[PDB]
């Protein structure tokens, strides 16, 4: 409704690509180790989630991926944006033989 010829998608990319990063070929069901970093007050710690990967979603800057682990008897999943600076290095560990693409059904485990 301003009519103006323009590639919405490509200005989109123009921005949302400086803020974009690619990772290891994980397909879902692959187990993975993310080496996450935390800041505690001036100091920068370093935890590490390590789980079955259940969902990759979207793309470009907004591309994300959800891990799921059992940490101390209580079950917990967690979802990273491919390009969050509080996420340092992902590392495939296993390659799952997965028949679906979203892996929700494994929340009975």
């Amino acid at each position: 409704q301003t009519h103006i010829k323009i590639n919405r998608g490509e200005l989109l990319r123009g921005i949302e690509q400086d803020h974009t990063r690619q990772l290891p070929d994980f397909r879902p069901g692959d187990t993975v180790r993310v080496d996450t970093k935390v800041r505690e007050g001036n100091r920068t710690r370093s935890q590490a989630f390590e789980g079955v990967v259940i969902a990759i979603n979207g793309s470009g800057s907004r591309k994300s991926f959800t891990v799921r682990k059992i940490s101390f008897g209580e079950g917990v999943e967690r979802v990273f944006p491919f390009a969050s600076p509080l996420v340092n290095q992902v590392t495939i560990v296993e390659r799952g033989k997965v028949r679906r693409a979203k892996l929700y059904y494994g929340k009975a485990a």
Binding site: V38, E40, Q47, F49, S64, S71, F72, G73, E74, G75, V76, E77, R78, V79, F80, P81, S84, P85, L86, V87, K107
Partner: protein
């Protein structure tokens, strides 16, 4: 998002097996002891807000008993927590730690992880008892 009827489980050895919510409040934890609310409302409780709660189940032997009331602080929203990078957490089961009026717990420790936001809002001690601070 916890609200008044929510039966969360308990992370402590304070003898409360299972506690059910009953009000919410919105006190930080500053100065002398805990404080008194943002106000009336706040219709929901999520991770590190306090909730007043009644006690639904307990250990046949332990500090705190079957009916005992008493304020708890949340540790495991089955809901989801968005941290200012985009990271999201979520725990499969809903849970809390029981506490006293200066903050720290009637427990001797904590079972299962806790969300780094408890650290945000200065619950030192519970964060310390915590087996994992995700």
């Amino acid at each position: 998002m916890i609200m008044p009827q929510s039966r969360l489980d308990v992370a402590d050895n304070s003898g409360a097996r299972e506690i059910m919510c009953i009000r919410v409040l919105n006190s930080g934890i500053g100065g002398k002891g805990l404080t008194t609310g943002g106000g009336g409302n706040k219709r929901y409780a999520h991770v590190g807000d306090i909730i007043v709660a009644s006690v639904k189940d307990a250990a046949p032997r332990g500090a705190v008993k079957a009916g005992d009331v008493v304020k708890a602080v949340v540790v495991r929203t089955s809901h989801a927590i968005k941290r200012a990078d985009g990271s999201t957490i979520r725990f499969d089961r809903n849970a809390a730690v029981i506490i006293n009026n200066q903050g720290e717990p009637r427990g001797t420790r904590v079972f299962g992880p806790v969300a780094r936001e408890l650290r945000d809002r200065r619950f030192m001690k519970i964060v310390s008892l915590a087996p994992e601070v995700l």
